[PDB]
Amino acid sequence: IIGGEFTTIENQPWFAAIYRRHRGGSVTYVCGGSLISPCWVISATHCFIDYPKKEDYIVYLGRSRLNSNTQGEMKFEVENLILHKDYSADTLAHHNDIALLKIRSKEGRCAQPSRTIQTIALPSMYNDPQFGTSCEITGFGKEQSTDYLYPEQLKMTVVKLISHRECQQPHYYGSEVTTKMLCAADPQWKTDSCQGDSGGPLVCSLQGRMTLTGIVSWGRGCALKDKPGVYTRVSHFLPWIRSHT
Ligand SMILES: N=C(N)NC(=O)c1nc(-c2cc3c(F)cccc3o2)c(N2CCCCCC2)nc1N
């Protein structure tokens, strides 16, 4: 997250931290995700496509820090890694960038909701907020494009939804953006998602309800003028989600 503010898991208790084990046993951070039910985390396919083996991954819920444990956190293995059959990647864009992880603990349990662990509602179908609505993004991704490290503390920021017609401009992304994607950015291009934020939540208040409107997917650079963050439009994938859960 470029700009924005530090936060803790209580302010985004559906946030899932996804890591991968290496050969030799080192564990590194991969991507964010969102808990949509006790046993299911939703994320981005591009996070896993190069290492598509479920046994390589670890999921934490209730975690506010990257490389130190948070009190009350839960750790899960991945019982099921479901990538979207229609995924593709062009130079920049990723299409159908959506993935489901079924989580199971070593004791065989799903998520127990607590103060630090809660589910996020999915939107009703084809129902998103109007352009210019302020939504929030959360993640452990880079604080600056030039950074070598990820932040140790969880971050969040606010971005405003951009219209398809506007994001369609050649100055913006041309035809790289489809109706299955959403664009969002700061009016000053001052704050944004970045590398390491992929798979995490774009949350909007719709109908008085905090709703998983998007999943961090791609962008050109981070917090660059005319280059918004691009998000998987969750409201266009409900059958896929419903069928696979
Ligand atoms: N909001 C947005 N402008 N960009 C995003 O959301 C974003 N950016 C990036 C991204 C671009 C980029 C860059 F030009 C210089 C330094 C760091 C960068 O990080 C990114 N990367 C992970 C995945 C593919 C591989 C590229 C890296 N993933 C993203 N989701």
Contact 216, 198 (CB under 8 A): yes
Dihedral of CA atoms 129, 134, 139, 141 in degrees, nearest 10, equals 110
3-state SS class at 234: helix
Nearest by Cα to 38 from 64, 12, 16: 16
Ligand 1: distance of its center to the CA of 113 in Å?
Answer: 32
CB burial string 226-239: b at 16+ within 10 A, e below: ebbbbbbbbbbbee
Please tell me the distance between residue 156's alpha carbon and the centre of ligand 1 in angstroms. 16
- Residue indicated by tokens 């479901």: 82
Tokens 């880079």, located at residue: 142
Which DSSP symbol is given to 10? G
Q: Looking at 84, 94, 95, 97, which residue is catalytic?
A: 97
Quoted resolution (Å)? 1.9
**Residue that has been written with the tokens 């065989």 in this structure:** 108
Q: Which atom of ligand 1 is nearest to the CA of 193?
A: 1
Distance CA 150, CA 95 (A): 26
How far is Cα 62 from Cα 65, in angstroms, rounded to an integer? 10
How many residues belong to the chain? Answer: 245
Q: Are 232 and 98 in contact (CB under 8 A)?
A: yes
Q: How far is CA 160 from CA 3, 33, 133, 245, in A?
A: 14, 21, 5, 30
1 within ligand 1 shell (Cβ under 6 A): no
Which DSSP symbol is given to 224? B
- Return the best residue to mutate from 159, 218, 225, 230 for the ligand 1 pocket (most ligand atoms within 8 A of CB): 218
Using the Cα atoms of residue 57, residue 180, residue 158 and residue 135 in order, give the sign of their dihedral.
negative
Cα–Cα distance measured from residue 218 to residue 12, given in angstroms and rounded to the nearest whole number:
21
Domain ranges of the chain: 1-12+120-235, 13-119+236-245
218: enclosing H helix or E strand: strand 209-218
| CATH class given for the domain over 13-119+236-245 | mainly beta
Q: Is the CB of 216 under 6 A from ligand 1?
A: yes
From residue 36, alpha-carbon distances to 10, 22, 39, 212 in Å are 16, 27, 8, 9
Query: 183 near 228, Cβ under 8 Å?
Result: yes
**Residue type for position 43:** S
46 is an active site residue: yes
Amino acid in the structure at residue 156: M
90 is a catalytic site residue? no
- Nearest C-alpha to atom 20 of ligand 1 is from which residue? 195
Nearest CA to ligand 1 atom 12: 221
Q: What is the CA radius of gyration of the chain?
A: 16
